[PDB]
């Protein structure tokens, strides 16, 4: 009938891809096909392993004749459950169709029914009245054993649906199918290759198949090995096929497959381009013009990035894990924010002051216990999944509950944080930076003595008290931030003034500041303990406040050409406004 599909006929015309390997799996199924009791086999394994292909592959082998003589003539049919229910509008239509099919099979005694997703029949034909389920109709024949059927299910299934009804499970013989080894996968791809080569009119290199399996399992962790490798191979041919010329590349070579894996895994590709090569080269100076001082922190951040792109990087850890500690007003956070801008990647920020309670930490990995809503996603895992190449900033990590550290421990050591739903987040390309203010009180503390002692070591001890040895062992570097020097402050003043000029440019105002005035601001605003934040306040009172009055009501409403100069006699600035 139309519902049934003779797989053997399909193979005869090339409609089923050939099977490679899995001889033990076929032998276990064939041994079960011929056993007196529990004749029905069940193919159970994870998605994308080959369970469906094995059932179709069996028919392919039969037509070829490389099967046991007992199974020399065994027709394998495929049930289309959708077609069974297509016209079952009137009462008894489902039974007539299903019973007509079973009668056909028992008469032959050679025909075998392959039913994919066997768990689906557990509720078919349950409209109303008789409520004759499809499993109920098949159960009598299966118990006797006159009819042989083949099933397929996932590990998710076979526990929640099929195993509920012991009547069906007892008859079926479970078979465990596991993904093949890396070496086995290369053999499989080589066997399927001629069909993919013809479709795309390209020749895959021997090394390319090894790279596809090795690269995909290494970076593509959301799928199983057989389909995962085949996906890369299928896409690689299409990429070459769509070149502007009819066929720019008639064959696929190593380092071409890498491009496909990069798009699928959203990881930076190897063979770095001149555009990104120059960016990494200038990533040490571009940051030094925005963040002054703390050169040791910039080098640690850029070297870890350069290493990963070069190919020398941790196998399972992230690109780099750093802890930024030190006094206030120093560029602990700013350097992280500017890093993401210099690299052109998404910045993931997480103010850890909002994760003090234990339940808050859970939100990162998953929703609350038994959350009624469907949005059971995690905040940390989703962000990393959405942006695998990013800067994972965790400011004020000290405030966060200790549980957060236990989460980062597996991240720094394994690079993957599985979520409640089973999705695996990849941290291999996400920079992990954590800023802490632990021991900041010691930095500003003044000793009881003529000389003010350093107190930096005391602050480090406090840091060690909170961050256990395990956490500090997995950190690539614990960069301490030195206090801002006078020379640095002068550079910082230019930065804030430039920002002021940008705000003024939006109002058609141009500001010129004499060098003498800049030093006056630096001297007045320089505070070693408080860093650079006071400088911003000094700019507000001296520069922004007079300008604000003029901008709102004065010569600078629609004008500009402001000229500031400091008179030495009164050590006070002189604001000159031109109406323009």
């Amino acid at each position: 009938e139309n519902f049934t599909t003779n797989l053997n006929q399909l193979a005869r015309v090339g409609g089923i891809d050939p099977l490679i390997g899995r001889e033990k799996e076929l032998e276990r199924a064939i041994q079960v096909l011929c056993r007196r009791r529990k004749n029905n086999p069940l193919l159970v394994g994870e998605s994308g392993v080959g369970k469906t292909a094995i059932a179709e592959g069996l028919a392919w082998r039969i037509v070829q004749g490389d099967v046991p003589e007992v199974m020399a003539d065994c027709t394998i049919y495929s049930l289309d459950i959708g077609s069974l229910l297509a016209g079952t509008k009137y009462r008894g239509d489902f039974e007539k169709r299903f019973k007509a099919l079973l009668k056909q099979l028992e008469q032959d005694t050679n025909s075998i029914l392959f039913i994919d997703e066997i768990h689906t029949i557990i509720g078919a034909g349950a409209a109303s009245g008789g409520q004759v389920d499809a499993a109920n109709l098949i159960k009598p024949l299966l118990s006797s054993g006159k009819i042989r059927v083949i099933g397929s299910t996932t590990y998710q299934e076979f526990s929640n649906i099929f195993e509920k009804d012991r009547a069906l499970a007892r008859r079926f013989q479970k078979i465990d199918i596991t993904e093949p080894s890396i070496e086995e996968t290369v053999q499989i791809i080589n066997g399927l290759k001629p069909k993919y080569e013809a479709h795309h009119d390209v020749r895959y290199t021997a090394k390319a198949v090894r790279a596809a399996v090795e690269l995909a399992v290494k970076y593509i962790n959301d799928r199983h090995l057989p389909d995962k490798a085949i996906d890369v191979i299928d896409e690689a041919g299409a990429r070459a096929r769509l070149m502007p010329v009819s066929k720019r590349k008639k064959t696929v070579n190593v380092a071409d497959i890498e491009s496909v894996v990069a798009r699928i895994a959203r990881i930076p590709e190897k063979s770095v381009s001149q555009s990104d090569r120059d960016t990494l080269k200038n990533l040490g100076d571009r940051l030094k013009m925005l963040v002054f001082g703390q050169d040791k922190a910039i080098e640690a951040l850029t070297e870890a990035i350069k290493m990963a792109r070069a190919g020398l990087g941790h196998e399972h850890k992230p690109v780099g894990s750093f802890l930024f500690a030190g006094p206030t007003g120093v560029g602990k956070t700013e350097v992280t924010v500017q890093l993401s801008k210099a690299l052109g990647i998404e910045l993931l920020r997480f103010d850890m002051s909002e994760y003090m309670e234990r339940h808050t930490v859970s939100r990162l990995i998953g929703a609350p216990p038994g959350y009624v809503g469907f949005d059971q996603g995690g905040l940390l895992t989703d962000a990393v999944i959405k942006h695998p190449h990013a800067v994972l900033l965790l400011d004020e990590i000290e405030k966060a509950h200790p549980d957060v550290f236990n989460i980062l421990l597996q991240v720094m050591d394994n690079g993957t944080l599985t979520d409640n739903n089973g999705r695996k987040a990849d941290f291999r390309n996400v920079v992990l930076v954590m800023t802490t203010n632990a021991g900041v009180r010691e930095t500003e503390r003044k000793s009881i003595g003529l000389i003010h002692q350093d107190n930096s070591t005391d602050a480090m001890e406090e840091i060690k008290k909170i961050f256990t040895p395990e956490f500090r062992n997995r950190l690539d570097n614990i960069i301490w931030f030195d206090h801002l020097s006078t020379d640095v402050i002068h550079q910082v003043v230019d930065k804030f003034i430039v920002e002021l000029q940008v705000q003024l440019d939006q109002k058609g105002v141009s500001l010129e500041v004499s060098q003498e005035a800049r030093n006056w601001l630096a001297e007045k605003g320089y505070d070693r303990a408080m860093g650079a934040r006071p400088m911003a306040r000094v700019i507000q009172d001296n520069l922004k406040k007079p300008l604000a009055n003029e901008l709102l009501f004065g010569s600078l409403v629609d004008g500009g050409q402001v000229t500031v100069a400091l008179d030495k006699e009164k050590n006070e600035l002189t604001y000159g406004f031109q109406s323009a």
Binding site: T88, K89, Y90, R91, A127, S128, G129
Partner: peptide
Amino acid sequence: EKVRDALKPPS
């Protein structure tokens, strides 16, 4: 609690 129902006419 809300579940769809599929009916069948007698003939």
